[PDB]
Amino acid sequence: DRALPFIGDGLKPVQRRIVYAMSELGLRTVGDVLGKYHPHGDSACYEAMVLMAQPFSYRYPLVDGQGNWGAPDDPKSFAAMRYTESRLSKYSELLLSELGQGTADWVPNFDGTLQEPKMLPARLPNILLNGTTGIAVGMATDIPPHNLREVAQAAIALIDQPKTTLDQLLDIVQGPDYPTEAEIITSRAEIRKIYENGRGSVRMRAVWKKEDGAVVISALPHQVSGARVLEQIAAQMRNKKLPMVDDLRDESDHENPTRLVIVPRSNRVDMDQVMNHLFATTDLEKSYRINLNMIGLDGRPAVKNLLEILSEWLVFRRDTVRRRLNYRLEKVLKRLHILEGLLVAFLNIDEVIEIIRNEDEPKPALMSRFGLTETQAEAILELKLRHLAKLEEMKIRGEQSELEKERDQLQGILASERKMNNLLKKELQADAQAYGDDRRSPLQEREEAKAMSEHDMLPSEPVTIVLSQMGWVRSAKGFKAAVKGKSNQPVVFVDSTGRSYAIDPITLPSAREPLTGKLTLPPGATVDHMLMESDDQKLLMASDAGYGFVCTFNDLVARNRAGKALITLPENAHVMPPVVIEDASDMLLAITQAGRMLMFPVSDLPQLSKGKGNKIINIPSAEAARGEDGLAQLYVLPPQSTLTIHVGKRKIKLRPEELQKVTGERGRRGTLMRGLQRIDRVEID
Amino acid sequence: DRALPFIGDGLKPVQRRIVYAMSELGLRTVGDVLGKYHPHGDSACYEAMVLMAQPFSYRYPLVDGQGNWGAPDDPKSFAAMRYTESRLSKYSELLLSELGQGTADWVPNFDGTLQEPKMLPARLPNILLNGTTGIAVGMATDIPPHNLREVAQAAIALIDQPKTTLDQLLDIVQGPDYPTEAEIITSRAEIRKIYENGRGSVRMRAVWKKEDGAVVISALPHQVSGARVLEQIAAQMRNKKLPMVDDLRDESDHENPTRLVIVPRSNRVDMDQVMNHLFATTDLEKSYRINLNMIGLDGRPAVKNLLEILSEWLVFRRDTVRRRLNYRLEKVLKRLHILEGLLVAFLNIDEVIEIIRNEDEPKPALMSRFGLTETQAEAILELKLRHLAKLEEMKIRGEQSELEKERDQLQGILASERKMNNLLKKELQADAQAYGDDRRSPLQEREEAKAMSEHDMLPSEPVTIVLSQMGWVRSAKGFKAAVKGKSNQPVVFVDSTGRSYAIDPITLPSAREPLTGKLTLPPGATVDHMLMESDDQKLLMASDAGYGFVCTFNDLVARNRAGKALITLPENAHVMPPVVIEDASDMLLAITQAGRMLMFPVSDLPQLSKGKGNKIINIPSAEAARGEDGLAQLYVLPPQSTLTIHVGKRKIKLRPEELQKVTGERGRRGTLMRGLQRIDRVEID
């Protein structure tokens, strides 16, 4: 319930018992088997058992489950289930193979009848491979499952070099590997902060596609049912939200395990926008808490690192192996001890018999001379005379010669940090190849999900907006002014006083209404320009007085009928045709009524939101008012391009080489160019 | 069903199986136990099992039965009965005690799964003790049960002297001893013919008493139910037979197991007569066939003698014992053989080891020298070095010394016909005292039962019959003539012509009828004498002509009205007052009208049935007719007694000394006595 797992085998006391109970060393129903090491009807055992029997619970199941095992986390009697129906999985061999080899400490059964292992001799770090379970909340720990092969290789790298940094390990260990083909979307940089602190969170997202018209979800985030997300998307439609979604059906089979169809209203629904709202508001994308809290080899609870986890596990695996070999060693050293004592009798029979014959207590007397032990002397006393035959001795010298070969073998490995390391790698490598499998949850960073407002759910379909000289607005479909875009984004106009206005294209009639009868305008003011670009689009606002500023399209969006005091016009000044900045690296070009040119990078004129703005090109105030001099042309254009300036029938050509000659500091009056007045047009080559 | 028993243990193959199945060596229900050595649902096993469970079936039951075990010889499933409910009786120990001691031959189980004994090591001759069973008819054998102690003593007498005659054995063995207190009534002389021929019959009778008025039967003949005899006596009453029996009731309890009351009509019913009719016509007395047919030690069927049976059994008991001892002997000789071989190693270790060490196959080489066996040498090879210690040797010499003592012991008994005989007696004696019991069926010879005729069932009560001078008959109760007796026996009269007549006292009126109006008499003939004695009573008939004869009262019984021509009277002769002969040894006394006396033993005058008879005393025919001389007095009287002969007032006395003087041959005229005429009376002193 609240217990942490062990670092050695990655099991809580309950799981360990369930696994051990089913091992070869559980030597008639299922209750019979579990009841042997578990209290009858015990609740925690029940839940832990049920969990183990289902797929998508463990990344590497310890049991092959077969049947229903009880509707949910409510009851199903283990007395109704045959012992046959539960089987330990091949993966389990990792935990149990080495049990009879002096590799675990043994403590009493739940009721003092039997004995059970304190720990299990896991060959691979199950702690990481399987981690914790249930993904509830208010757990004391949260360990994600990892890929066996990644971790294996990562443990191997650490045997070869303990000073292996985390970065090197994260070039092997990608991150959690969940029993689902849904993606882990969190940054690899963020997936690193987790493994340095042993704590954080990881996010997943359902895998989807567009199947002509509708959307098909094929893979779902770890432990979220089709029913769950399909329920949320349905509540969003039941509410006057998600109006773009027409139908929703669950077409899951056995051909397609998790096929969910989301049918949009029409053909021109931006389903990426929809999908990006759903990941933000449904479990089609989900956070998973990570807290690598566990019990260490020092028997203390501690949240630890990927490094720390893998190191400390290594010292446990080493210890486990030390034991495994020694278990054989002790068993071989003993027989050699015995064989020697027997061999002492063969060479000294006349003497050994004579002492057996002539003295009171033969044994103590036999270990005195010969220098034997109270166990060699015993073996000598138990010798049948038939064992004293030549042929019998040759059997003994043989067995002895093998067992001294084997003894050196084991002792050599047990005396070498290098030989022992070669051994562990080879086992780790073989186990990786034997019990391993490919990655399931791929790491794919994705465009972060964002919810939309009830505003940007509305229709949205291609429209061309037209304002003509007559002062009338005509919103068309798919002469003075024409602009591009969707139907939900607004259309801006700017008046001859320096005010911006927003109108919705939904309010304007078709290609078959006066603008003055839509906007509250200052006395006499004419509507000069019209704009329609992305909300965040960069713009250059300016006045023919020579002042201006950079701003975003948003800073022009004034929805209220009065308008917004945007750019302030000096005496008798007019608003310049606004420039759409299409790259911060572009150049600004200023041309004056007298024929002076200045150029500077547009990322050099301050960004404001309203006001007179700063100087762009110097023209005396008095001279501007009288319409004498003043700013006539203003362009933001790609760097190092060529222009043809039209002055009537004349086409004065300007290459980047002549433009490098008018490049200067902002606010300067700029260099004068001969006969460059009354410019009719400026084209960009 | 039709198999004979074995002489050794007195069992048929079925019984043997039932007993063995329940022995210690039947190692969960009752069917489970018997089904182990018997075919399932087998019929003969079923009957034989049921039989064994009831008392009064066996004289020495082999099983203590507890429960109903199936109404009659119909079914009761042995699968419904717990193993507990059947137990082998203490008596059985006689048959089973010696089974694991090489005392039986072993042949396969009914189905080849197990092994069972061919015979059982019976210590006492169960063949006689229990015999056969069921007492059906058309059996191939019939062996009565006998008393254990009688037979035991009888077997013992035969060990002491095989030439013991049958007569000596029949002074120990009384005869059959049945599980009932009813009597064996057959003659001991007849009980001997049976035991010499091995075949014959024995008769039994119910034990009874008179309980003021009625009769109480307490013990019944072997295997006859109260219900059976009580049914027969009831059919006799239902029929116009047994009219003297009034009521009949079965007052059996648990205070009185077999109490049956037979109530007579009155007080004066001769219930001995009744009882003596019932033994003759009901099973209150019964014959039992004896046919001592059995299987001998030569495996052949043969009916044999009490002698033969007991002898042949003795040779089986001897054989059984020979085995029992030898079984121990072989087991002791072997250990001694082994002990010796071991002892050979202790004294020759240096040598034995050196050969074990230096040669290819030690064993064959070790039996070569030392002169050992392929089993001693084995025991030496199996010796642990620790067995070679001093202390171990002293254990071996000890065990050896005891086992040589024991060996001589057994071998001494096995080498002596005398020592062996002492052994068997002692066992037989102890078993007799241990498993024995007193006799149940006593031998009591009794008055052989005889049925009565519908005639002698009639009333019968004391009556005095009176015929007076007037010629009238008056049958009284409880003057010229008075006679004694019962009322069913007839009354005889004899006329003056020599004819006898029978009349029934039931036809004559009381003490308040003329005889001529009852009998057809010759013209003028007077009725002279009247007699009434037992039917078979001896009588002396004679005529005053001097002729006569001896006859039985029956020879006077003529029931037809005409009469019977009994004694022929010479011219003018008269019939003498008939003499009741009360002892064949008595003397006849003849006195003549002239005064001549003759005497001779009455068993000296020929016995006839009718006619003139032979001479008694010589008197010339002519002189008799003329009434001159003639036979005047005739007496049959006790030998050597004294008489006073009355001649008026004179009383002439005659002692045996004067009568020895008139003793003579019959037919002689006899010796003349002075003044002995007109005798008025003859009294006997």
Coordinates of C-alpha atoms in Angstrom, one line a residue, chain A residues 136-319:
Chain A
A136 CA -2.6 6.9 -8.6
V137 CA -1.9 10.1 -6.7
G138 CA -0.4 10.6 -3.2
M139 CA 2.0 7.7 -3.7
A140 CA 5.3 7.7 -1.8
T141 CA 7.1 6.9 -5.0
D142 CA 6.7 7.0 -8.8
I143 CA 9.1 4.9 -10.9
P144 CA 8.4 4.8 -14.7
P145 CA 9.2 1.7 -16.7
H146 CA 12.3 1.7 -18.8
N147 CA 13.6 -0.3 -21.8
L148 CA 15.6 -3.4 -20.7
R149 CA 18.2 -3.0 -23.4
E150 CA 18.9 0.7 -22.8
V151 CA 19.3 0.1 -19.1
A152 CA 21.4 -3.1 -19.7
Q153 CA 23.9 -1.2 -22.0
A154 CA 23.9 1.7 -19.5
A155 CA 24.8 -0.7 -16.6
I156 CA 27.5 -2.2 -18.8
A157 CA 29.0 1.2 -19.6
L158 CA 29.2 1.8 -15.9
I159 CA 31.1 -1.5 -15.2
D160 CA 33.6 -0.4 -17.9
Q161 CA 33.7 3.1 -16.4
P162 CA 32.0 4.1 -13.1
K163 CA 33.0 7.8 -13.8
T164 CA 30.5 7.7 -16.7
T165 CA 28.7 11.0 -16.6
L166 CA 24.9 11.3 -16.7
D167 CA 25.0 12.7 -20.3
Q168 CA 26.7 9.5 -21.5
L169 CA 24.0 7.4 -19.8
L170 CA 21.3 9.6 -21.4
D171 CA 22.8 8.8 -24.8
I172 CA 21.9 5.2 -24.0
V173 CA 18.9 5.6 -21.7
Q174 CA 16.4 7.7 -23.7
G175 CA 14.0 8.0 -20.8
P176 CA 10.9 6.1 -19.7
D177 CA 9.7 3.3 -22.0
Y178 CA 6.0 2.8 -21.4
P179 CA 3.9 -0.3 -22.6
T180 CA 2.3 2.0 -25.3
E181 CA 3.2 3.4 -28.7
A182 CA 2.1 6.9 -27.7
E183 CA 4.8 9.5 -27.6
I184 CA 6.8 11.0 -24.8
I185 CA 6.8 14.7 -25.8
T186 CA 8.9 16.2 -23.0
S187 CA 12.2 17.8 -23.9
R188 CA 15.4 15.7 -23.7
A189 CA 16.9 18.6 -21.7
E190 CA 13.9 18.3 -19.3
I191 CA 14.2 14.6 -19.3
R192 CA 17.7 15.2 -17.9
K193 CA 16.7 17.4 -15.0
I194 CA 14.5 14.5 -13.9
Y195 CA 17.4 12.0 -13.9
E196 CA 19.7 14.4 -12.0
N197 CA 17.1 15.1 -9.2
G198 CA 15.4 11.7 -9.3
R199 CA 12.2 13.7 -9.5
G200 CA 10.0 15.6 -11.9
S201 CA 7.3 15.0 -14.5
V202 CA 7.0 13.5 -18.0
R203 CA 4.3 14.2 -20.6
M204 CA 2.8 11.8 -23.2
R205 CA 0.6 12.3 -26.2
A206 CA -1.7 10.1 -28.3
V207 CA -0.7 9.1 -31.8
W208 CA -3.0 10.3 -34.5
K209 CA -3.5 10.8 -38.3
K210 CA -5.9 12.4 -40.8
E211 CA -7.9 9.8 -42.6
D212 CA -9.5 11.9 -45.4
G213 CA -11.8 14.2 -43.5
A214 CA -11.7 12.9 -40.0
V215 CA -9.0 12.1 -37.4
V216 CA -8.1 8.6 -36.2
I217 CA -6.4 8.1 -32.9
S218 CA -4.5 4.8 -32.8
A219 CA -2.3 4.9 -29.7
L220 CA -3.3 6.4 -26.3
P221 CA -1.2 7.7 -23.4
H222 CA -0.2 5.1 -20.8
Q223 CA -3.3 3.9 -18.8
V224 CA -5.9 6.1 -20.3
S225 CA -8.9 4.2 -21.6
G226 CA -10.6 4.9 -24.9
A227 CA -13.7 5.4 -22.8
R228 CA -12.1 8.2 -20.8
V229 CA -11.0 10.6 -23.5
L230 CA -14.1 9.7 -25.6
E231 CA -16.1 10.8 -22.6
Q232 CA -14.3 14.2 -22.2
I233 CA -14.6 15.1 -25.9
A234 CA -18.3 14.3 -25.6
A235 CA -18.8 16.7 -22.6
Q236 CA -17.1 19.4 -24.6
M237 CA -19.6 18.9 -27.4
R238 CA -22.6 18.6 -25.0
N239 CA -21.4 22.0 -23.9
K240 CA -21.5 24.8 -26.4
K241 CA -17.8 24.2 -26.7
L242 CA -16.0 22.2 -29.5
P243 CA -18.7 23.2 -32.0
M244 CA -16.5 22.3 -35.0
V245 CA -16.8 18.6 -34.1
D246 CA -19.7 16.9 -35.8
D247 CA -19.5 13.2 -34.7
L248 CA -17.4 10.9 -32.6
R249 CA -17.2 7.1 -32.8
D250 CA -15.2 4.3 -31.2
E251 CA -14.2 1.9 -34.0
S252 CA -11.8 -0.3 -31.9
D253 CA -11.7 -4.0 -32.9
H254 CA -8.8 -6.5 -32.8
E255 CA -7.7 -5.3 -36.2
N256 CA -7.4 -1.9 -34.7
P257 CA -7.1 -2.0 -30.8
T258 CA -7.5 1.7 -30.1
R259 CA -9.2 3.3 -33.2
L260 CA -11.2 6.4 -32.4
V261 CA -12.7 8.6 -35.0
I262 CA -13.3 12.4 -34.6
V263 CA -15.5 13.8 -37.4
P264 CA -15.3 17.5 -38.0
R265 CA -18.3 19.6 -39.2
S266 CA -16.8 20.3 -42.7
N267 CA -13.8 20.1 -45.0
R268 CA -12.2 23.4 -44.0
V269 CA -11.9 22.7 -40.3
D270 CA -8.3 23.1 -39.0
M271 CA -8.1 19.8 -37.3
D272 CA -4.6 20.5 -36.1
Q273 CA -6.1 23.4 -34.2
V274 CA -8.7 21.0 -32.8
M275 CA -6.2 18.4 -31.9
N276 CA -4.1 21.1 -30.3
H277 CA -7.1 22.1 -28.1
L278 CA -7.8 18.5 -27.1
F279 CA -4.3 17.7 -25.9
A280 CA -4.6 20.8 -23.7
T281 CA -8.0 19.9 -22.3
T282 CA -8.4 16.0 -22.5
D283 CA -6.2 13.1 -21.5
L284 CA -5.2 12.6 -25.1
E285 CA -2.0 14.0 -23.6
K286 CA -1.0 13.5 -19.9
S287 CA 1.5 14.4 -17.2
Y288 CA 3.2 11.6 -15.3
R289 CA 4.8 12.4 -11.9
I290 CA 8.3 11.0 -11.4
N291 CA 9.6 10.3 -7.9
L292 CA 12.4 7.7 -7.7
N293 CA 11.9 7.0 -4.0
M294 CA 13.1 3.5 -3.0
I295 CA 14.8 1.5 -0.2
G296 CA 18.6 1.4 -0.5
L297 CA 21.1 -1.3 0.3
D298 CA 21.6 0.6 3.6
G299 CA 17.9 -0.1 4.2
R300 CA 17.0 3.5 4.2
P301 CA 14.3 5.2 2.0
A302 CA 15.8 7.7 -0.5
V303 CA 14.9 9.4 -3.8
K304 CA 18.0 8.8 -6.0
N305 CA 19.6 9.5 -9.4
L306 CA 19.7 7.5 -12.6
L307 CA 23.5 7.4 -11.8
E308 CA 22.9 6.6 -8.1
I309 CA 20.3 4.0 -8.9
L310 CA 22.4 2.2 -11.5
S311 CA 25.6 2.3 -9.3
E312 CA 24.0 1.0 -6.2
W313 CA 22.3 -1.7 -8.2
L314 CA 25.6 -2.7 -9.6
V315 CA 27.1 -3.1 -6.1
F316 CA 24.0 -5.3 -5.4
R317 CA 24.5 -7.4 -8.5
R318 CA 28.2 -7.8 -7.7
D319 CA 27.4 -8.9 -4.1

